[PDB]
Design a binder for this molecule. Structure first.
Ligand SMILES: [Ca+2]
Ligand SMILES: [Ca+2]
Ligand SMILES: [Ca+2]
Ligand SMILES: [Ca+2]
Lengths: 80, 38, 77
């Protein structure tokens, strides 16, 4: 599970911008509610459990939400 | 008026709506988001 | 992040908010964004305008208020 070998600063800025679209209130975390809001804009209707599954696979410290370090770590990983 | 329009254009750029519309067309949300930034 | 703002930056962002809040009702709507964008030579679709509101509409009430505008402005410095 390494992050992508070539991770540019501009890709990191895009990760911050993407994070800010989920964390709209700017408290530095993404909740299941904030994730559901964005995915309902996408045309998906996930359940409260499906949302918790997607949070859980990004949530490295198990505190129930996603912070930017967790988001960035997962994003640069999927960047491969 | 010119000062106001410059401020407006700068703030509108802050929405990055082209980048955001790219995500929406692409939409496993996090994998698909990786593709847009890829 | 909005707390890390100087007096001058808040005063500036307050002035900027009023440029978009055309009717002075304390909210920015899709229609007000559209009016400004078209005055600058952009021609967004209604869907794009709603996406723009949705980007920063943290409380989901359907418009941008000054707290949300300040959060946007502060985090993008
Ligand atoms: Ca949040
Ligand atoms: Ca966490
Ligand atoms: Ca208004
Ligand atoms: Ca709002």
């Amino acid at each position: 599970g390494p992050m992508a070998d070539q991770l540019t600063e501009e890709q990191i800025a895009e990760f911050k911008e993407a994070f800010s679209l989920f964390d709209k209130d700017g408290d530095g975390t993404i909740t299941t509610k904030e994730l559901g809001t964005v995915m309902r804009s996408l045309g998906q209707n996930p359940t409260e459990a499906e949302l918790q599954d997607m949070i859980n696979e990004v949530d490295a410290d198990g505190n129930g939400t996603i912070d930017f370090p967790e988001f960035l770590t997962m994003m640069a990983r999927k960047m491969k | 008026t010119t000062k106001g329009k410059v401020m407006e254009r700068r703030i509108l750029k802050d929405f990055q709506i082209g980048f955001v519309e790219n995500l929406k067309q692409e939409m496993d949300i996090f994998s698909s988001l990786a593709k847009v930034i890829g």
